Amino acid sequence: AEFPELCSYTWEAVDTKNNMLYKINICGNMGVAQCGPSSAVCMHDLKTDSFHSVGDSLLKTASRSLLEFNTTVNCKQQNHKIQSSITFLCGKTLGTPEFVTATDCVHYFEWRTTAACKKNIFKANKEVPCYAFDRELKKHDLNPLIKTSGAYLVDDSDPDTSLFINVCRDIEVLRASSPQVRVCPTGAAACLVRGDRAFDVGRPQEGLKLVSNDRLVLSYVKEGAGQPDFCDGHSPAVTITFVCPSERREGTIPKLTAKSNCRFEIEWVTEYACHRDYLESRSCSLSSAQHDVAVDLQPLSRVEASDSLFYTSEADEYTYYLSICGGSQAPICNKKDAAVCQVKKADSTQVKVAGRPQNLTLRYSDGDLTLIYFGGEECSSGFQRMSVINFECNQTAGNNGRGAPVFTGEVDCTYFFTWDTKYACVHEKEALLCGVSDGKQRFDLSALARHSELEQNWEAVDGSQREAEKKHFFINICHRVLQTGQARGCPEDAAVCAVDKNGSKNLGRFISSPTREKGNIQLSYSDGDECGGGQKIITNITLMCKPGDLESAPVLTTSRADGCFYEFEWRTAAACVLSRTEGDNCTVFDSQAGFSFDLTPLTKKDAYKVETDKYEFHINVCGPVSVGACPPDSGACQVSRSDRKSWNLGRSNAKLSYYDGMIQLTYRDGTPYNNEKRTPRATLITFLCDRDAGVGFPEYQEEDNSTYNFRWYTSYACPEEPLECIVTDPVTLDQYDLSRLAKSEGGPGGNWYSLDNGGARSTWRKYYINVCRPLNPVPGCDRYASACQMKYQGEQGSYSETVSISNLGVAKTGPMVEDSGSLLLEYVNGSACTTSDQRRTTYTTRIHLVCSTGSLYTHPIFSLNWECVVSFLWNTAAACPIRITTDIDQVCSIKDPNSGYVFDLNPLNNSRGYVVLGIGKTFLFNVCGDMPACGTLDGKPASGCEAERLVGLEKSLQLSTEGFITLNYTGLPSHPNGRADAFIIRFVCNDDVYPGTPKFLHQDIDSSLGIRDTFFEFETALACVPSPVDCQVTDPAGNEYDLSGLSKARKPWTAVDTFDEGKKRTFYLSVCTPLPYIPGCHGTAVGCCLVTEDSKLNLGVVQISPQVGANGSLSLVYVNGDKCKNQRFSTRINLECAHTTGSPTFQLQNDCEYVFLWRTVEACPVVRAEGDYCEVRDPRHGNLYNLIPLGLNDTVVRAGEYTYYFRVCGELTSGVCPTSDKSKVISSCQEKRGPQGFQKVAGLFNQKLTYENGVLKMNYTGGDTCHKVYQRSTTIFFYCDRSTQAPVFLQETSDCSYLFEWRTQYACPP
């Protein structure tokens, strides 16, 4: 019959408004027929559950593109039937029959197929339905993800094999992109391509189902004979599972879960799997709370300067004049004010209104945009003459991107128009993938997709010359930019967004997939907002690999200074090479995200239970299931439900394998199943990420007596959930970068630990913390919890000193910028806590970052543990704003103002010079202005050559504090009293490199008058800031050692080398900070540089946290040297406290270990010494912290509403609240404004400051009653700085105790 590939299935059509699911089938073979036999259209009203008979398929008629179903049952209007009408248009896919509108007794349907396309050029041989419908009649349509040219590569860890699926139809093999997808057999859909040979694995049998939770399933199966020899007697079949990505489920590429026979199994988390948008509206410009769909038909009424501002459709017998969405009509209708009006070609006088612009319905049904009119005229039956218009997503349209309406198939005075246009052409959800392929090696940028979660997108820092008018750059890596805080009112279908006071700006669109370029991943956004000359804003995010660093943000590296181009650069982790990694003790170490998935929280000792109709599976992660029916070492065991006969599905296995957000536990061997091959029963459980699913229930899915395959929606199979330690101040626009204080696994381990002493050996609560991540594995305290409180279980036994648990909080917020230029970082929703038990809740962790522009070392200090809020205090370098700090003077030495690091490019001062071979242009080059091989100009021998010799140049460089250093040379000709030829060099970090050579990045010559600049970037080791270091190290016993003093060095630490033959060599050495710029050394980070013979053995890299030992002892090993007999190196510095401060002495040498014994006073454990009046005597340095010069004034601090007077070391004199007559010796007051200004008494005078590991805590206690029990204390923390004594109120801790930090000069050890 008509439309031959449309009979085999039953098609469903929802009307979202009324909730009436219409079930259609063309030739009338319906299985759900409670309605009449051979039912064409069976209306199922969902709330009355009525099954009305709308179509008799035996009375099916036809028109040019139009199936009518004219039933026998009479309408409540006489001589009318309950008609239905299915209009047929061309898509690229089979589609689904969307619901246009309906009066009481006709129902109109748009249905855009391949079956309507009678030009079958590259036709689909087998094409199944691709839509589902859950209980509430919400749509899972996936038609726009059907690739009609080529196949989606399915990401597995096998470099040799490659599966190539194509959703809901056979793979177009002929006109395809890849060389190995042309090899494919015809009519295949799964196409395993093994070693220049493509098998037909999957064939489309049945259209996709919704069987599970909300995830769709779709199964391909190949039946018959001629199975490959891979399958070992199984039919090849591929089941793809379509998941919708929420905040819980991350990915956007299809992943191969089970490759353990020709039964393949794919979890594909696509945005199209999500509930498809049904948003209709009144005249034009439909939009909803979901701001992904953007329609406006004003540009179909706002006609170009070209003539005939109305449209004309060329029709059957008589042509239709029409002007939609409030445009000037045709003069042939004269005076109708009709947005469409039909015109008779017999007589120009008989004109009938076919639509009016009072009654519209611009309906966006499931990607298929429709525009309906109503109440045109009366026709020959009694039907109001209405008219529909079906828009098509036709990009390169005629009439300057508007296109013309074609008329298709009038029924019952209802005119169906099809319209190829661009201003009704939406990408609603992303169809494009975010994986690439460097031939073999795959990548996945799905982690850094903030994917329609409506939780804030990324904010790009300005590393690059922002000016006065500096803006918020809101990128989103793989999606339309999320409409959230500070990004709402942005033009939607933008990927990067530029927003200011003046207005938001589109800054590129996700037009094309990512591409692997130049040893990184480029991500080019074309088609942005309009720049100067009708050029659109391009944007090139270069996502680079950095292992474990998901918490960074894109730096803005360059611009073009005319707003046509903005290049970003992201030192991320989700743009690093995917690899299979394997784990032994039920712990698999993720490499490309720096996570370590332990699944021992899933080991239930009493069994799990999966129940299908035929079997009961008792399965257990990383351990034997205890059920007496099965063999004892059973990892999994199916018992029947009728026979109750056991079969052992593989013996106990603790071997996990992680690849691309799924952990495969395979269980196999065990008990065979009575075949002459003696094939053992194996099963494979796939743990894959669901951030709020707990331990999870495993699921069984397959369809034969076969090798069994489970998936397990864990919470513990999940990476860090990148949350971007970056905060932009709203009122100023100062970005702060905490993304280098994120300590990640794979490195030397460690955490940000901070002790609390107070009372001896009880409430020694040693608090671990980590910034914007989960913790590292630290035994016993939680995973996915950023801070855990490890108390001591030590009864003074040297062996009996260990740590045990509390669980403080999970990083979801990211840093928030607080008052007085500090920034607060909340961890909400920890473990259940004890308090004043009026309300017990989850723990929180407040950590306040106040910045000291000191040295590279950073150690957190413990503020308070108060009413389920553990406070903290970051004295770091990274908490200060982003500064670029250009130096026009001497060039190959630059100091970072925040970190205090010195980038020296003196080993890049190559006296032979660097040759940059360019594009038919030789650039001879050197960085410190050395190379006189070219023109030695007036005081400019500065290495400026485009070869025959361009110029000698004036020199300047800048840093950014965020992975950007550039040297902006400028030649002697300032070109015609304008700007000059100023050609630029850029730095980035390759860790494993020598000093190196340039690679010639693009030159950009634009003679505006005389401007040109030739950028040539080069990867060197001397280019990026080392991560802030924890030079303070604990031991298991609780002695808190601190070597931060040994890293403050005026000259780098030498060593008395007097032992080994009394040689004339030196031995440079450091502690927890790399050695500075000793020439002829591997200076990326070096522990100790030996100097002799110009044979400079660089014999160790800096170990951040040294090894521990006995009472008052450390040991520090530098592990990664050079060139010694299958050993890199080792240098042991025994940091053994005596109480001199001598030089680390050369002890002896053997087996390429150079060993030193450092008698320092830094190697003594930190003791909290409590001081006298204002002074602390001999706190392990033998110095005195006399802070009475800060008691010479009333010190006013402020909050927003509150005010906090106090006075260091005695006797606050004036206030609003010296309102007492007692012995009150008031040294504080917390205040308010005029209303509710009964303001409270001090922390009373103590004249006692306690020394805490380099902070000085002064405690003013014994105020008035606060809420219930505690008194209104105040506390001052004195940290090192050059007396920026404008106090940081440490905001929103305990409401009964106020923390202050003074960045004062007297608190510094001299």
Ligand SMILES: *[C@@H]1O[C@H](CO)[C@@H](O[C@@H]2O[C@H](CO)[C@@H](O[C@@H]3O[C@H](CO)[C@@H](O)[C@H](O)[C@@H]3O)[C@H](O)[C@H]2NC(C)=O)[C@H](O)[C@H]1NC(C)=O
């Ligand atoms: C921003 O990213 C886009 C990527 O979409 C860059 O466009 C690409 O620019 C390169 C370099 O000229 C083009 O490569 C050329 O390819 C041809 C063959 O197609 C080859 O014969 C040439 O030797 C050259 O390698 C590439 O075609 C082009 N891609 C486009 C336009 O889609 C753009 O240059 C980047 N902008 C930057 C870094 O400022």
Ligand SMILES: *[C@@H]1O[C@H](CO)[C@@H](O[C@@H]2O[C@H](CO)[C@@H](O)[C@H](O)[C@H]2NC(C)=O)[C@H](O)[C@H]1NC(C)=O
């Ligand atoms: C959008 O529709 C237009 C108009 O039908 C298509 O443009 C035609 O394309 C064919 C094939 O290349 C050309 O032979 C015609 O000359 C084009 N028409 C005009 C007026 O120039 C266009 O191909 C459609 N785009 C898509 C993506 O389907």
Ligand SMILES: *[C@@H]1O[C@H](CO)[C@@H](O)[C@H](O)[C@H]1NC(C)=O
């Ligand atoms: C269908 O409806 C039209 C309009 O009333 C009528 O003229 C035609 O005869 C009908 N045909 C069938 C088969 O029901």
Ligand SMILES: *[C@@H]1O[C@H](CO)[C@@H](O)[C@H](O)[C@H]1NC(C)=O
């Ligand atoms: C480079 O330095 C010159 C100094 O004359 C300056 O005019 C120019 O703006 C600087 N930057 C660039 C990108 O050329």
